[PDB]
Amino acid sequence: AGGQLNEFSSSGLGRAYSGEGAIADDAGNVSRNPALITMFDRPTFSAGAVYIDPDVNISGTSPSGRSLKADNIAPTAWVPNMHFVAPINDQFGWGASITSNYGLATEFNDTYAGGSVGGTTDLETMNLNLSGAYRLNNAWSFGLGFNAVYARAKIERFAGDLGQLVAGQIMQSPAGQTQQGQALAATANGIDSNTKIAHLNGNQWGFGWNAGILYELDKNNRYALTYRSEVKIDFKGNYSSDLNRAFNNYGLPIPTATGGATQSGYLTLNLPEMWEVSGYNRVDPQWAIHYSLAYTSWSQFQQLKATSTSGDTLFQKHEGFKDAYRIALGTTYYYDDNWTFRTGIAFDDSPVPAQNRSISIPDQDRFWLSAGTTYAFNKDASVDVGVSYMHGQSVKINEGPYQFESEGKAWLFGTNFNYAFHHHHHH
Ligand SMILES: CCCCCCCCOCCOCCOCCOCCO
Numbered sequence: 001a002g003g004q005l006n007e008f009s010s011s012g013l014g015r016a017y018s019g020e021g022a023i024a025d026d027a028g029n030v031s032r033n034p035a036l037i038t039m040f041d042r043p044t045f046s047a048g049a050v051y052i053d054p055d056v057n058i059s060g061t062s063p064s065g066r067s068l069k070a071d072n073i074a075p076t077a078w079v080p081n082m083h084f085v086a087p088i089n090d091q092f093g094w095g096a097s098i099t100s101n102y103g104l105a106t107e108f109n110d111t112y113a114g115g116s117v118g119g120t121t122d123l124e125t126m127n128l129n130l131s132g133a134y135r136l137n138n139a140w141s142f143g144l145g146f147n148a149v150y151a152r153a154k155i156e157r158f159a160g161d162l163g164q165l166v167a168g169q170i171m172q173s174p175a176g177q178t179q180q181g182q183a184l185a186a187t188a189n190g191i192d193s194n195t196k197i198a199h200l201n202g203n204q205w206g207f208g209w210n211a212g213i214l215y216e217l218d219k220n221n222r223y224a225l226t227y228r229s230e231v232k233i234d235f236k237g238n239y240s241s242d243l244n245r246a247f248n249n250y251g252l253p254i255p256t257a258t259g260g261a262t263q264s265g266y267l268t269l270n271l272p273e274m275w276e277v278s279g280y281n282r283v284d285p286q287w288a289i290h291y292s293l294a295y296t297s298w299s300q301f302q303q304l305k306a307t308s309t310s311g312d313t314l315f316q317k318h319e320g321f322k323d324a325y326r327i328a329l330g331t332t333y334y335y336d337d338n339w340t341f342r343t344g345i346a347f348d349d350s351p352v353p354a355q356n357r358s359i360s361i362p363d364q365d366r367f368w369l370s371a372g373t374t375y376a377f378n379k380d381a382s383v384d385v386g387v388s389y390m391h392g393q394s395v396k397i398n399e400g401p402y403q404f405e406s407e408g409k410a411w412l413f414g415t416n417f418n419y420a421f422h423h424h425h426h427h
Pocket residue numbers: 159162163164165166169187188191252253254401
């Protein structure tokens with residue numbers, strides 16, 4: 001939740017990402033737990049993508065009387081994944097992957113009446129991971145990984161109906177009868193709803209590490225603990241606002257006006273650390289259950305704040321997230337040599353306290369329902385197909401001069417192809 005993504009594989013999608021630190025039926029899980037490397041005795045490849053089709057809607061009425069209805073404010077997304085794992089020795093192995101652990105997109109029409117808190121909010125990240133692992137004995141394995149994260153981000157906000165609202169208050173006040181107030185009201189009326197009042201964009205790399213432990217009770221039952229470090233992205237990018245500079249320094253609740261001029265802006269984005277415990281139990285030749293609890297330190301994300309080369313605040317939005325958990329439970333039906341089926345459910349606690357909710361990050365507690373299948377063409381190759389349905393609760397949002405309600409759900413569809421090489425690294 002809150003911009004965190006779980007879509008590292010399509011088999012995982014069909015499980016509702018349950019017990020992902022503890023299952024190693026394909027190469028995708030190494031990205032989640034590097035210790036799982038020790039479960040692979042030949043070079044193994046997996047690649048695919050998950051298509052996310054959100055349906056997130058906003059409703060309400062502005063004090064101007066304009067509707068705050070906004071349908072489908074969360075664009076579709078295509079999240080790819082690629083994974084490779086290989087033994088080095090009977091005791092060591094390595095793996096690498098390309099995945100995305102964080103990403104968000106919320107995009108309103110630029111004439112939206114609530115544009116000052118709407119507009120566009122986009123974050124895309126690509127996690128490049130290189131991992132290694134060591135098997136201590138039949139029971140214990142340990143893994144460590146290095147992550148290089150590339151992030152591209154953009155925020156835009158627009159005037160919306162603020163100009164109309166301000167003109168209305170001026171004209172209803174004693175100032176409405178003065179030359180000064182009338183001049184200000186004309187200026188306020190002149191601010192078109194699609195006037196850009198903030199633009200931030202930048203691209204940057206950050207770095208992190210991750211680690212895992214695997215405990216195998218036997219070949220059919222294992223448990224895992226993993227940690228993914230925080231990743232700090234220190235963007236240096238562009239900031240501008242098309243409002244006249246004369247708007248500045250009155251304490252108005254709008255971003256810094258720059259008369260359309262671009263200047264360098266700095267913003268630090270913290271991608272939060274995450275812990276996860278997982279279990280996998282193959283209770284029968286044809287059946288396994290798998291389950292997990294994850295804890296994400298979303299308290300590490302406190303605000304979006306862009307500052308200038310003089311250290312002044314250009315744009316600032318308080319977020320105040322809280323640490324949050326995700327719990328998931330799934331089962332896998334190993335039907336025959338070709339067919340495997342799976343299903344799962346999960347609950348994702350929103351890291352956003354009610355008072356801190358915003359329409360640009362329209363988040364809510366989410367429930368997952370998942371189903372999937374894998375067809376193995378032979379001992380070396382297979383395809384995974386997965387589908388998930390996510391449903392969140394409708395919530396009230398109070399932001400700036402506006403009151404909104406938000407509702408959200410999503411469909412997710414994923415396909416992966418898997419290939420294992422006829423190749424061993426024994427000594
Ligand atoms: C004119 C385009 C940019 C807007 C200039 C600054 C706008 C900041 O003011 C906040 C707008 O809020 C509207 C004020 O509503 C009238 C006051 O009474 C309503 C409070 O309940």
